[PDB]
């Protein structure tokens, strides 16, 4: 009973632009995968052993307390610049990584802030006076913010439910946001309006994450079913099922096949895209897995957090417990790896955010 | 209900919380009222503190999550104060209460299970 | 029968007199030779009740060989009452009976460092480190090499102690404290990281590493080191107190209060955490926090010292003096409580209370204090007396 | 869904009076005339060769109506149980506090929630090699927990 709905011409134009920006990106990703497959197994095994030895000696660094409110989310800035944190208060500070110095705290919220995720090309090819980060609160608000203004921007009033998380597209012009109204919005930066409201789940969506190429976009919420929609014409065929709890975290690997989803049933689902099956059901931790982050463009690991005081950095593939990144005092909410791969930041409910780095 | 009351429990979670509050008040280990609950939370002897979303005003119960930020205790909000009042055994509706730890009580495992189940709702 | 005779002699020494206990001890010593326990009990009975103790030490040295504790007690009784170069000759004669450099070499080095001619003490410490190197022997050799000057020989001795005693974090902490007083500071942090990765659970070494990472700027690394020290135990109260002090040293008072609340929720039975929570709280809100700390952790010296400081800060000397007396009577071995009592006696009161506090500090030597260990571990005040260290701890408050 | 309806002692007392009155009236009248999510735990023990401890673990698994498996190998004993939350909590309290092992220590490797049960009954499997135990776990669809237990045992033996 897949219901169809007629959309505007601007949504079709944005979908055509996303397809024209994702098809050469997918071609370059397939060419990089074919070039990595042409490498011999000895050098790849040596690189995997070096990555495992670097991830095994993961020490704590850049631990700085934000405020009296517990931290809810953290997102690493591109090119190892900073790390934007979002706590339970109305302030969203940005710690200057790796020094973790507080500078230009973005305020303007009243309720508990959700996920403050910056743009993938904010510090690279975007001006700091314009919009660089996007945050959400416990009410209906998706507010953009700069890095040197200490003030929010013109938000979108198209959300009337609890916006849990938000993630910007790798192209930069689009941004998805998971709301509690059994739908997920896709706002645009060029048209400055909500282009699509995908409703395909029974409950409200919690975490949404787009692919590395920009063609596919993963979903997930309290309906215990993972969705993977397309940015061209919808029609989500890669429906993820198997988890009996609420999915609280989705992460898209840079490889076109693997995709890691974090549910509240104390497990993680590493599913393939070329086969549409559950490749791995990894028992990461014993608590509810909320935060989950894929690897950078090298594509070697996966950092899945939980509601306990630890975080598991596992290999990709293999699903082996490579690193136990413990050190927190509360529920680890929100984690993200940097663009360089040498550090991975993780927040917690103890009002502090640390990072695992090589010694 | 009130949007300021967070976190909010489900139906079976509120039924289990009411059963735990009735077992604590029947064993002389529960404190009724918001003032006694906040005093037990500030004294460091309260194992869990439960609230209710049907309070007028809802900001007067707002000290119950904030004390959870002052003593690291799990907090939860009931759907109605009349069921929490009857659960406490008091004819008057209760918008707040506290299950305190005792010197080797038999309901310690149920209180630990309620604290583990109430800490995952705040996400 | 000898154990029952020793128990009856102990009961007679505790009851009415000391002549019958000494006669029973002499009969038990002349009936049959025993182990070092009966000789140590006879030496303690002679010291607690001059010439008789020296005669008992000579009889224990002539009849009970391989007794290092009785020989050390006899050398201390000869140095105190009789003579220091006579006790030095007694220790040199006892060195020919026991060739082990475990306790006789350290006692000889301490006896040579208490007097002049410290080059002989340095040569004896080098011979003890080259003959049979231990953990405490190499620590005392590094301390004797670093008390004079930060020479490269002290760094070589610290490197040899780290290579031979890598499991002991005291040598790594001494090497980090020696490298922290040099021109550079990265070598001390590297030695502290090696000691934290080689112990693996070292609380004062990680505390010194966090202090070095906080004093040289970029204190987020110091907070990460404090979190790794709290997770490496796991849940250590000292690392949590150090993290709370590092959070309270900056402008984040609410984060320090949240860290103190998390430390109280993770470890309510801690005196230092209760004192930090009573000191970080508000001044009209401390009257309930002190009562909660007394009800949760009763008969604690740190909580009693915090209650005495709160009573002295509330302009009530009549309650603060009683709280300091109760803290000195509950645990007289604390350094911070004795320093706070000396500061309260010097601030408000006559000279008799300060003289009584000085006599109580000189009777039992304080140790394991927060402000006492900051001056007892420094090289500038290492070979000082207890009264000068207490005055330096009271003047720095 | 349903909520418990409790009253105060006084209210109950009134009911008692009424109840007795009604009873008296009647008397006087008679004289005058595991679905929706199952908790699955997996523990790792160093040595499970004791017959009494294995019999006690089998009795605790059978009395609590929980299914699973108990695989033994070279210094690696993987005990996987699956059932309700109270049965899994009682089994964890028995294996962590009541079952006294002692170099032999038993720790819980994982504890999560699944959709349905995998094994039918508690069968004490035995395999000297890890490949046979991995194939027996993959035959029932539980090879990931056995691989995680083997990786945790390798990390405990290496460090």
UniProtKB/Swiss-Prot annotation, chain A:
Keywords: Acetylation, Disease variant, mRNA processing, mRNA splicing, Nucleus, Repeat, Retinitis pigmentosa, Spliceosome, WD repeat. GO terms for biological process: mRNA splicing, via spliceosome; RNA processing; RNA splicing; RNA splicing, via transesterification reactions. GO terms for cellular component: Cajal body; nuclear speck; nucleoplasm; nucleus; spliceosomal complex; spliceosomal snRNP complex; U2-type precatalytic spliceosome; U4/U6 snRNP. The keyword Iron does not apply. The keyword Glycosyltransferase does not apply. It is found in: Nucleus; Nucleus speckle. Its main location: nucleus. WD repeats lie at residues 66-105, 108-155, 158-197, 200-239, 242-281, 284-324, 327-358. One of its GO terms (molecular function) is U6 snRNA binding. It comes from the Eukaryota. Plays a role in pre-mRNA splicing as component of the U4/U6-U5 tri-snRNP complex that is involved in spliceosome assembly, and as component of the precatalytic spliceosome (spliceosome B complex). It is linked to Retinitis pigmentosa 70: A retinal dystrophy belonging to the group of pigmentary retinopathies. Retinitis pigmentosa is characterized by retinal pigment deposits visible on fundus examination and primary loss of rod photoreceptor cells followed by secondary loss of cone photoreceptors. Patients typically have night vision blindness and loss of midperipheral visual field. As their condition progresses, they lose their far peripheral visual field and eventually central vision as well. This is U4/U6 small nuclear ribonucleoprotein Prp4. The chain holds residues 164 to 522 of 522 of the full protein.
Curated annotation (Swiss-Prot), chain B:
This is NHP2-like protein 1. The keyword Cell cycle does not apply. Residues 91-123 are annotated as: Important for U4 snRNA-binding. It is found in: Nucleus; Nucleus, Nucleolus. The keyword Transmembrane helix does not apply. It comes from Homo sapiens. One of its GO terms (cellular component) is U4atac snRNP. Keywords: Acetylation, mRNA processing, mRNA splicing, Nucleus, Phosphoprotein, Ribonucleoprotein, RNA-binding, Spliceosome. Ubiquitous. InterPro entries: eL8/uL1-like, H/ACA_rnp_Nhp2-like, Ribosomal_eL30-like_sf, Ribosomal_eL8-like_CS, Ribosomal_eL8/eL30/eS12/Gad45, Ribosomal_eL8/Nhp2. Residues 31-43 are annotated as: Interaction with U4 snRNA and U4atac snRNA. The record marks 56, 81 as: Interaction with U4 snRNA and U4atac snRNA. PANTHER family: RIBOSOMAL PROTEIN L7AE FAMILY MEMBER. Disulfide bonds: none annotated. Changing residue 33 to K: Abolishes U4 snRNA-binding. Its main location: nucleus.
Swiss-Prot record, chain C:
It comes from the Eukaryota. Changing residue 189 to W: In RP60; impaired function in pre-mRNA splicing; mislocalized in Cajal bodies; partial loss of localization in splicing speckles. It is found in: Nucleus, Nucleoplasm; Nucleus speckle. Phosphorylated by PRP4K during spliceosome assembly. Widely expressed. HAT repeats lie at residues 16-48, 50-80, 82-114, 149-181, 183-215, 315-347. Involved in pre-mRNA splicing as component of the U4/U6-U5 tri-snRNP complex, one of the building blocks of the spliceosome. Enhances dihydrotestosterone-induced transactivation activity of AR, as well as dexamethasone-induced transactivation activity of NR3C1, but does not affect estrogen-induced transactivation. It is linked to Retinitis pigmentosa 60: A retinal dystrophy belonging to the group of pigmentary retinopathies. Retinitis pigmentosa is characterized by retinal pigment deposits visible on fundus examination and primary loss of rod photoreceptor cells followed by secondary loss of cone photoreceptors. Patients typically have night vision blindness and loss of midperipheral visual field. As their condition progresses, they lose their far peripheral visual field and eventually central vision as well. This is Pre-mRNA-processing factor 6. The gene is PRPF6.
Swiss-Prot record, chain D:
Transmembrane segments: none annotated. One of its GO terms (cellular component) is cytosol. Highly expressed in retina, liver, kidney and blood. Detected at lower levels in heart and brain. It is found in: Nucleus; Nucleus speckle. Ubiquitinated. Undergoes 'Lys-63'-linked polyubiquitination by PRPF19 and deubiquitination by USP4. 'Lys-63'-linked ubiquitination increases the affinity for PRPF8 and may regulate the assembly of the U4/U6-U5 tri-snRNP complex. The keyword Transferase does not apply. Keywords: Disease variant, Isopeptide bond, mRNA processing, mRNA splicing, Nucleus, Phosphoprotein, Retinitis pigmentosa, Spliceosome, Ubl conjugation. It comes from the Eukaryota. One of its GO terms (biological process) is spliceosomal tri-snRNP complex assembly. The keyword Nucleus applies. Its main location: nucleus. Component of the precatalytic spliceosome (spliceosome B complex). Component of the U4/U6-U5 tri-snRNP complex, a building block of the precatalytic spliceosome (spliceosome B complex). The U4/U6-U5 tri-snRNP complex is composed of the U4, U6 and U5 snRNAs and at least PRPF3, PRPF4, PRPF6, PRPF8, PRPF31, SNRNP200, TXNL4A, SNRNP40, SNRPB, SNRPD1, SNRPD2, SNRPD3, SNRPE, SNRPF, SNRPG, DDX23, CD2BP2, PPIH, SNU13, EFTUD2, SART1 and USP39, plus LSM2, LSM3, LSM4, LSM5, LSM6, LSM7 and LSM8. Interacts directly with PRPF4. This is U4/U6 small nuclear ribonucleoprotein Prp3. The lineage of its organism: Eukaryota, Metazoa, Chordata, Craniata, Vertebrata.
